[PDB]
Amino acid sequence: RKREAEERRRFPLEQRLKEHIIGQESAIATVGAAIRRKENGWYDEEHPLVFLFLGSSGIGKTELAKQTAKYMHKDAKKGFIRLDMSEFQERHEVAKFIGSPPGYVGHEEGGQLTKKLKQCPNAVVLFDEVDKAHPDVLTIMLQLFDEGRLTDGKGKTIDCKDAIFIMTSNVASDEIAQHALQLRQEALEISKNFKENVIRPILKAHFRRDEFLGRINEIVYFLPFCHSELIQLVNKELNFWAKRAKQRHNITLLWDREVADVLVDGYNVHYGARSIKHEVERRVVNQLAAAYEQDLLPGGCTLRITVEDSDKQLLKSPELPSPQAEK
Amino acid sequence: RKREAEERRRFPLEQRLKEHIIGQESAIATVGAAIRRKENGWYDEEHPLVFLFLGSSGIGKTELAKQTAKYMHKDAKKGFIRLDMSEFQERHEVAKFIGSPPGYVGHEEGGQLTKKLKQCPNAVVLFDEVDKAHPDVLTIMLQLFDEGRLTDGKGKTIDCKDAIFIMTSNVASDEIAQHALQLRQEALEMITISKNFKENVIRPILKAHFRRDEFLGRINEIVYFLPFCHSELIQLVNKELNFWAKRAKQRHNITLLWDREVADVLVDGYNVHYGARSIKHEVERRVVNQLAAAYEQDLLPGGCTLRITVEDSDKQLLKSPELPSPQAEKRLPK
Amino acid sequence: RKREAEERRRFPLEQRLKEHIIGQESAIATVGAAIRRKENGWYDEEHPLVFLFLGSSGIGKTELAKQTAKYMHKDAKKGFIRLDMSEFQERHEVAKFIGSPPGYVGHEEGGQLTKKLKQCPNAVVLFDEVDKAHPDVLTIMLQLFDEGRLTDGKGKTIDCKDAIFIMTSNVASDEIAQHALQLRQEALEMSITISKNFKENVIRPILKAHFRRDEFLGRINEIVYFLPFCHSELIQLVNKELNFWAKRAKQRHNITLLWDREVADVLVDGYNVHYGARSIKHEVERRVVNQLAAAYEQDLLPGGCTLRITVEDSDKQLLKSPELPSPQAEKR
Amino acid sequence: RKREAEERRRFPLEQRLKEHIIGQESAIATVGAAIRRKENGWYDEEHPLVFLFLGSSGIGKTELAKQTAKYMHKDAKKGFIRLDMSEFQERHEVAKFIGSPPGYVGHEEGGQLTKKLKQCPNAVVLFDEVDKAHPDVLTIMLQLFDEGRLTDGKGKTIDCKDAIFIMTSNVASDEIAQHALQLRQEALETISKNFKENVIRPILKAHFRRDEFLGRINEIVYFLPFCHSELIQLVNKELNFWAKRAKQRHNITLLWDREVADVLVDGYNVHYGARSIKHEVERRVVNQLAAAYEQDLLPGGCTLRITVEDS
Amino acid sequence: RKREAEERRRFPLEQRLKEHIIGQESAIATVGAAIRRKENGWYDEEHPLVFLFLGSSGIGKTELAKQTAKYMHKDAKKGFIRLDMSEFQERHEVAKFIGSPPGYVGHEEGGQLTKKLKQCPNAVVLFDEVDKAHPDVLTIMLQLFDEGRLTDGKGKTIDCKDAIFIMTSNVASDEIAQHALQLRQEALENFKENVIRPILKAHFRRDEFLGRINEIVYFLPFCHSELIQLVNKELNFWAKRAKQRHNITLLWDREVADVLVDGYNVHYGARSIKHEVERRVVNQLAAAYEQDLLPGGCTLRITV
Amino acid sequence: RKREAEERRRFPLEQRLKEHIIGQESAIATVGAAIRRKENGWYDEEHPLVFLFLGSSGIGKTELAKQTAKYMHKDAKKGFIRLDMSEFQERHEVAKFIGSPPGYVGHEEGGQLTKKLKQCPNAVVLFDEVDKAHPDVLTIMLQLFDEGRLTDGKGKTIDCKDAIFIMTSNVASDEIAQHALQLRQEALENFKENVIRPILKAHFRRDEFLGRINEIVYFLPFCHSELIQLVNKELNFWAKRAKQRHNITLLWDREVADVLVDGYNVHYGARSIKHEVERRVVNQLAAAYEQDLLPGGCTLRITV
Ligand SMILES: Nc1ncnc2c1ncn2[C@@H]1O[C@H](COP(=O)(O)OP(=O)(O)OP(O)(O)=S)[C@@H](O)[C@H]1O
Ligand SMILES: Nc1ncnc2c1ncn2[C@@H]1O[C@H](COP(=O)(O)OP(=O)(O)OP(O)(O)=S)[C@@H](O)[C@H]1O
Ligand SMILES: Nc1ncnc2c1ncn2[C@@H]1O[C@H](COP(=O)(O)OP(=O)(O)OP(O)(O)=S)[C@@H](O)[C@H]1O
Ligand SMILES: Nc1ncnc2c1ncn2[C@@H]1O[C@H](COP(=O)(O)OP(=O)(O)O)[C@@H](O)[C@H]1O
Numbered sequence A: 001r002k003r004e005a006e007e008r009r010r011f012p013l014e015q016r017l018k019e020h021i022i023g024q025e026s027a028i029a030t031v032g033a034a035i036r037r038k039e040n041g042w043y044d045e046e047h048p049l050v051f052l053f054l055g056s057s058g059i060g061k062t063e064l065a066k067q068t069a070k071y072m073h074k075d076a077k078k079g080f081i082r083l084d085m086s087e088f089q090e091r092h093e094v095a096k097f098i099g100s101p102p103g104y105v106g107h108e109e110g111g112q113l114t115k116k117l118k119q120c121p122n123a124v125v126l127f128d129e130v131d132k133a134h135p136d137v138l139t140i141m142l143q144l145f146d147e148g149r150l151t152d153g154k155g156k157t158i159d160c161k162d163a164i165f166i167m168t169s170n171v172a173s174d175e176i177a178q179h180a181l182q183l184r185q186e187a188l189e190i191s192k193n194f195k196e197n198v199i200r201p202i203l204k205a206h207f208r209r210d211e212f213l214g215r216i217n218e219i220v221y222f223l224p225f226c227h228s229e230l231i232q233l234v235n236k237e238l239n240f241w242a243k244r245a246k247q248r249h250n251i252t253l254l255w256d257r258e259v260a261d262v263l264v265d266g267y268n269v270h271y272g273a274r275s276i277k278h279e280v281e282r283r284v285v286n287q288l289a290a291a292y293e294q295d296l297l298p299g300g301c302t303l304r305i306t307v308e309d310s311d312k313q314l315l316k317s318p319e320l321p322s323p324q325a326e327k
Numbered sequence B: 001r002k003r004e005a006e007e008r009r010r011f012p013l014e015q016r017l018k019e020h021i022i023g024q025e026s027a028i029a030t031v032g033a034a035i036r037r038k039e040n041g042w043y044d045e046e047h048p049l050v051f052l053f054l055g056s057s058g059i060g061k062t063e064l065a066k067q068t069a070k071y072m073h074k075d076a077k078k079g080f081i082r083l084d085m086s087e088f089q090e091r092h093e094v095a096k097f098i099g100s101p102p103g104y105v106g107h108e109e110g111g112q113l114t115k116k117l118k119q120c121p122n123a124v125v126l127f128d129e130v131d132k133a134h135p136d137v138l139t140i141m142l143q144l145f146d147e148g149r150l151t152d153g154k155g156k157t158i159d160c161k162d163a164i165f166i167m168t169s170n171v172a173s174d175e176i177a178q179h180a181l182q183l184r185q186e187a188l189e190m191i192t193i194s195k196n197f198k199e200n201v202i203r204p205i206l207k208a209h210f211r212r213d214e215f216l217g218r219i220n221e222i223v224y225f226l227p228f229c230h231s232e233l234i235q236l237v238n239k240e241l242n243f244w245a246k247r248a249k250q251r252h253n254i255t256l257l258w259d260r261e262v263a264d265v266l267v268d269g270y271n272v273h274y275g276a277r278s279i280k281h282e283v284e285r286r287v288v289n290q291l292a293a294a295y296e297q298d299l300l301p302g303g304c305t306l307r308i309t310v311e312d313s314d315k316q317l318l319k320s321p322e323l324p325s326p327q328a329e330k331r332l333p334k
Numbered sequence C: 001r002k003r004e005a006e007e008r009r010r011f012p013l014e015q016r017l018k019e020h021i022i023g024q025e026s027a028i029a030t031v032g033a034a035i036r037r038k039e040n041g042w043y044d045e046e047h048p049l050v051f052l053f054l055g056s057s058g059i060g061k062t063e064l065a066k067q068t069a070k071y072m073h074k075d076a077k078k079g080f081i082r083l084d085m086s087e088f089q090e091r092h093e094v095a096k097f098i099g100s101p102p103g104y105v106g107h108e109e110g111g112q113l114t115k116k117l118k119q120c121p122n123a124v125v126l127f128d129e130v131d132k133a134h135p136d137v138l139t140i141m142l143q144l145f146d147e148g149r150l151t152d153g154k155g156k157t158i159d160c161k162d163a164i165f166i167m168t169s170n171v172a173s174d175e176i177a178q179h180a181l182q183l184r185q186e187a188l189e190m191s192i193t194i195s196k197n198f199k200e201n202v203i204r205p206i207l208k209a210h211f212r213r214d215e216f217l218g219r220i221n222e223i224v225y226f227l228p229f230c231h232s233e234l235i236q237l238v239n240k241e242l243n244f245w246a247k248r249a250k251q252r253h254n255i256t257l258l259w260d261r262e263v264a265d266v267l268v269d270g271y272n273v274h275y276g277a278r279s280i281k282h283e284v285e286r287r288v289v290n291q292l293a294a295a296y297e298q299d300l301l302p303g304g305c306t307l308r309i310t311v312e313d314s315d316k317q318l319l320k321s322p323e324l325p326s327p328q329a330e331k332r
Numbered sequence D: 001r002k003r004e005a006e007e008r009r010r011f012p013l014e015q016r017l018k019e020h021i022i023g024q025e026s027a028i029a030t031v032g033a034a035i036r037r038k039e040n041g042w043y044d045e046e047h048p049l050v051f052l053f054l055g056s057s058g059i060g061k062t063e064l065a066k067q068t069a070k071y072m073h074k075d076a077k078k079g080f081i082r083l084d085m086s087e088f089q090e091r092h093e094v095a096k097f098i099g100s101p102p103g104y105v106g107h108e109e110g111g112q113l114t115k116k117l118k119q120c121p122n123a124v125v126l127f128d129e130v131d132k133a134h135p136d137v138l139t140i141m142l143q144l145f146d147e148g149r150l151t152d153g154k155g156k157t158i159d160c161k162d163a164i165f166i167m168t169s170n171v172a173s174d175e176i177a178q179h180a181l182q183l184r185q186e187a188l189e190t191i192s193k194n195f196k197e198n199v200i201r202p203i204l205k206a207h208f209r210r211d212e213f214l215g216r217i218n219e220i221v222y223f224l225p226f227c228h229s230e231l232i233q234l235v236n237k238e239l240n241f242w243a244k245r246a247k248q249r250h251n252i253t254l255l256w257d258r259e260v261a262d263v264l265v266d267g268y269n270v271h272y273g274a275r276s277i278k279h280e281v282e283r284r285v286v287n288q289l290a291a292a293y294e295q296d297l298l299p300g301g302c303t304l305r306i307t308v309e310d311s
Numbered sequence E, F: 001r002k003r004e005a006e007e008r009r010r011f012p013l014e015q016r017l018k019e020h021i022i023g024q025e026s027a028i029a030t031v032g033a034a035i036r037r038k039e040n041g042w043y044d045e046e047h048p049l050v051f052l053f054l055g056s057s058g059i060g061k062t063e064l065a066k067q068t069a070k071y072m073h074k075d076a077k078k079g080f081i082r083l084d085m086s087e088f089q090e091r092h093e094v095a096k097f098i099g100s101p102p103g104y105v106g107h108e109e110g111g112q113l114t115k116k117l118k119q120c121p122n123a124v125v126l127f128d129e130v131d132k133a134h135p136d137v138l139t140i141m142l143q144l145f146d147e148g149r150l151t152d153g154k155g156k157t158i159d160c161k162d163a164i165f166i167m168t169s170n171v172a173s174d175e176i177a178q179h180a181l182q183l184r185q186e187a188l189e190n191f192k193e194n195v196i197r198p199i200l201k202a203h204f205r206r207d208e209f210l211g212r213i214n215e216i217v218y219f220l221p222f223c224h225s226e227l228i229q230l231v232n233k234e235l236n237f238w239a240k241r242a243k244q245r246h247n248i249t250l251l252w253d254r255e256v257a258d259v260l261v262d263g264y265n266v267h268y269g270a271r272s273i274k275h276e277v278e279r280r281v282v283n284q285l286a287a288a289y290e291q292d293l294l295p296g297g298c299t300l301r302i303t304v
């Protein structure tokens, strides 16, 4: 008890997530508060904890879910359960949850989800892209979210009252991103309850049933990044590549402050972080790989990126001559 | 003779339910009357007793069913049979009730519901969220509700005549809620009764969109759950706070107190579409989160008090065992 | 010979049925005539006798079938083979009739129907709610009717030529009910209900669409139509229910129960055409029986308890005295 | 490591593609750069590499995909997985990818795409003419393109993080051609910046209705219409193919001059591109060779000059 | 090698076509030229041959396809496959063409086209009345023609590079019949029929549909000479098959065969003329035989 | 030789059928003539033999098919094969018509048709309503023509050039009944194909399904003489069917038949007359027997 409490206080989940997620402070704060509430025993054991993650594309929803799963279960693969709801676009596909009835092909195998949950009753379940499921498939989750009960095709009931369920979608993402015009309001010169009652009609229009929505403990809103968070993302990506280069080939990598400013221009609000990822890859790592194959990067050398309308690489001082693949 | 004398004394079922349920007086009365009738004889043994529970979400339908099962069979697990009809969305899934026919996988296993009913013939059967089932699956329930007889894949009848069947659904949720709101508005001029509204409005819904006539004909009683009144919302908030205070005292020896304004602020977060679940989540979010954060060495076994800040109806804080001191900032960004 | 002499005399099937069934006189007459024709041999003895029962819900189809089975076989349970077709909604369900083939799971049990038939060749077989059966099941049924014998999964063939097959459904229930109500209204314009063969021809396409086997319908010996109850038949139903409850009370607790025509009218006012006798049964249970059960634990004692109507609700009178018992108000 | 790196330096992928692909320099450069970045280990292993080929019909998109697959998996047919999204033009066609759920016909079989991917995790997957898919069929591709993960009807999860996905379509063909005119709109007194992709995005979003789908695509490769020189090169390629075929089959030598290439190009059709050129050559020249051969006017070993044989 | 040499050296296809087909000389020549060109190389083997047969119905189109399938697969009936696109007019009928997805109705069947092709990839496929094909079926056929590659619903892929696809329709039958640029004008056995191209364009995705077609074959209405040849061939078939052998040499003179042609039924095609001949040529023979009236045979002489 | 002589003596088959059938002389004569022609080599014996029978239900179609099978086949109608195409649908076509082949859901190879054709290739095969037949089964039935060789669930194919197929329908039932000229004007006191395939071509795609049918047989509404003859035969059966036949007198049997025919068969066929007889006779006799009013020498009773 004492060691767990001391470790949690010393290195909170919220500080652990911040290492991997940039921004999203209100989502981090909500998930951390719920998690901490559960861990300290201040939770009802009858009803499992359920989250729904909403916002635009590529802003860390599945990332946050993965980090939460890793934190809850340090490494156990069975502790984290993935479900790509995009494979459940038809009603009949719900059989994958619980398996076929008696007398039907595949009956001897129980429900896949039932088996997975049985292997780890307190696992973290991620229904990714839940809006891509057929809405009759979501009906199977009514008892799962209310009481953590699920009966396979063989009549065996699974108890998962202590599990944590996370759903992710971008259902209201235009309306959430449009409400980030509150960042543009500049009053000196974050989502309101009444906005959540404008985001509701959209949720019921998609997720047809009020008894489904009334089962979720928390709706988490992920906002579009502000300019500083874009700079942080670019720096994070460059640091990742620098670490990889240093580890693999002992190459030291440096970049001026203006490199991030140049790179952020590739940001696409419709795609989020992955846009920055692709931009950095395309217009830095391509040059890096071309130089490496050309053998212009001796082990232990120092490479610094300089800023033009394009990006140049200096081998500790001289400009590295760009190789010619076409010869 | 003493069992008979107790039964003469055994009239708390309404009390037992009202302990766990707030409001829904009409439903409690109906269920209690039917159960008393069955208990004291005065009931035909040739036909099971069937209820259908209708209303909005999070208003005690499943809760009432579970409480009734517990009362009838005490803690006996075999006495309460649960089925989540959301798993029966396909016609072929009816095989779960009776098992596979001879010469097919799982035939030797036999029906599951048939086995459970054999274990406890007088069990309380709950088909939760029945309107999620494929109508062809409901078709099998005709015989079960009429004569309480079901034949498994092996040809064995179970003869569950004296069981009790409870069905929970929200098919007419929007109509019932709107009608109840209108009736309450009318009563506000100067309470929970609907005479023909059921036949003219509810019945065509139930029949046309989901069922056959013969299926509805076998239901002994239709029970209607209405949305909570404001006082009932206050009662629900008080119930949740009492539950959390009981947990705190029992486990951490912490005494928890609050005020009426706390109840008002909490109920302000109530959402009609979700019923008691909205209040439950609100209480967990705005109070229990602060209690769990204070439990990092700032809570000790004393009279912790919950109060509203100077910002009326905006914020609420914990105060220490000694009321003159508010609890600190919980200091997360160490 | 003694059994034959006793059966036909002093106890015709119609006489017995009228004891349990209210109305449906035409159906009772048809069933009795067909049964007598079969018994005396003035019928196609080369084929089993087949019936189809149609009409709204709660009008005695299953009840009439059960009473007929009891009359044919007295108390012999083996003489009444009951099959609820709602379990045969899938193609492979036919295996239950004959069991699995040799070498398969459960083949040693060659189907329930075959075993029961060989146990009682002349048993009355009821396929309740036949319309729910899968078309392959209906094909097997038609094969059984035409052939007159069935072969189990073990290769044994069982002769059931003398068996009686009864089927119940509600395929044309709405058409039958609305036509019967229209004929009652038309007869009130004369101031009754005998449905003409042209209405049967109108109904026939519905049956042809549902079953899609013109030979299957043709093979049916008799189609029996049950009508929705008239007001007098509803009053009789209410009186029957009240008599049942009164005799139950008298036997169990020596309580005498009385009522008046007004009570019967009030109870029948709760009738619902879509559910038939079930609606009246439930109304009687909730309106009256609930009060009896509530008052039983403390107030009821041997004597004359009479039901009365104050204005619109049913009230009770004290034993042998015109005092209204105080209801044992639950809770407090 | 050193031998493979030296081999790649000696004979890069670009030359191999140029052996067969004509023009499309920008597309070849982009694909080659991405492939080299992958091979040299300078790529994140958490996400597969995804391409989207856009351009008019008959300009080598699927041809480029085939050449790339051959380069990566030259000695493995299993290394190249081909799909044709015309065969997926309705929502329920997703059941081909992962198979039917438990208790349904074909369940025991399992997904086809899952089988193929499991056989060769690092294969090259080609979704030919993806635009013809029902849009809800593309939804199944989200996990594939993001994490290279897919689950069949039996619950088995296929990991293909190192695979390469190529999607070919002509959704913005007309707009791409109009932009390509920019190079041909020059005052001229070859490479387009193509920042106008900001206004190509709406077309894709209209067709592919989900932004998250586009966000998962690493690169958008644009194939431009052939120029006059590229058309001449294509005609020369076709005539070389036919000449070598004649030599190998009937031992006949076949020869021509500029007048033939120009006359064949003059019959070019934009709507078909390389296919137009193929049809033109076949109709105008191959028919004459076949007729002459059937008349036995071509003794074995003889030499033909196409001395501008026209009209 | 000797088998291949004999296959090459055997009778030219046009010989058999002329043997069994009457008229349609232009179509015979075109098909023979295309097949010979393919055999002698001079044709990219990477793409299957695609033929579009135009003209009135019932004038040998299917017969010509059968004979072609006979040339290449004389020893195998499976070498010829038929599909009538009157079966394939609505979106859900795409699943009948190449099979349903797994877990759906008819998945086991696997579709008509693939089910037959997998047995004989190099067969001859006849799509009757492609006009009636639903656009989504037209999309799968054009894909198949372009690539020669198709997947069934069960995931099995089929290579049909060397197959021969023949499409038949009557979209421009009236224009060909009325123009008759060869029949009654040049030969009754280039015309620059430039209206057929726009006519077809109006009915399909001309970019792909007409671009991929390897060849277009025209069928012309029968002429008087062709009709009398067909009647002579029918009467000879009846005469030689006379199993009551001794009545053979029931010779049909000339003018009665001309009167049988005068029962013009070309609207229904050749089989119509067959019925015409059978009516007043076979019924009288059956009546006489049943009556035992005519042992030893007789001239058909004149009747009507 | 004795079997051959017996088969020869079976003719005239028209008398054979009339021994057990009433009316339908035209159809009987047509069938007999077709049989003779095929036997005598005056038919396209290379092609399957197929009739389509048209008219209302219950007018001797099944009765003529069964009598034809009983006579042609030696005895017991072993070579008869009749099926209800109304139960054949997309979910049942292959599983029953071809019969669920190995590897399919179900192992009922043959299913309903080809499981019996394994023994009697020349079967008389009855399809009881093409109006209710599924398009898939109507297409697979196209194999039955040309050469037959319909695929079985076991893979076996039967050459149908010798088989007899009897499709039937009620969709054309009006074409005969509405006129009654084919009955009134057929040498009693209209024309063959008065209208060529009026409804049938539009409904069953004459191009394939009906184009391959060799003959069409009309069925006419029963005449008053035919109806009264049916009544008389049924009454004779009941009279002899009596166990205590001494009580059977049949006094006024002709008058009772006249009363019975009042409920004329104009609804679904002779079964209407059978029900008339059962209602107006059998019930009365059963009631009298129950009342012990039948000692012997008992007359009839004229009701109405
Ligand atoms: N703070 C961040 N926000 C978003 N992405 C981040 C962040 N930090 C790192 N990333 C990375 O950027 C990528 C974003 O992709 P996702 O995690 O899947 O976001 P998403 O919310 O699920 O978008 P969709 O709904 O799948 S389109 C991930 O690969 C992350 O690892
Ligand atoms: N004609 C009747 N006379 C007396 N009691 C009847 C009569 N009909 C029904 N009952 C009673 O009310 C109950 C109704 O059940 P059934 O008669 O079997 O239903 P049904 O008439 O067949 O219509 P379905 O099958 O529900 S659509 C019976 O169990 C009887 O006890
Ligand atoms: N750029 C090219 N250089 C040389 N050959 C080419 C080129 N493009 C196409 N071809 C050839 O022309 C044919 C066209 O094939 P594709 O490459 O597949 O066309 P496509 O662009 O991919 O587009 P679709 O599917 O008609 S939209 C192939 O036969 C190629 O071999
Ligand atoms: N020499 C011939 N020319 C044309 N048709 C012929 C010849 N011999 C037979 N036929 C008949 O022509 C038909 C061939 O197919 P056909 O009907 O003409 O094509 P389609 O129906 O598609 O228009 C067959 O019915 C065949 O009997």
Ligand SMILES: [Mg+2]
Pocket: A061, A062, A128, A129, A168
């Ligand atoms: Mg995601």
Ligand SMILES: [Mg+2]
Pocket: B061, B062, B128, B129, B168
């Ligand atoms: Mg509930």
Ligand SMILES: [Mg+2]
Pocket: C061, C062, C063, C128, C168
């Ligand atoms: Mg019943």
Ligand SMILES: [Mg+2]
Pocket: D058, D061, D062, D063, D128, D168
């Ligand atoms: Mg292509």
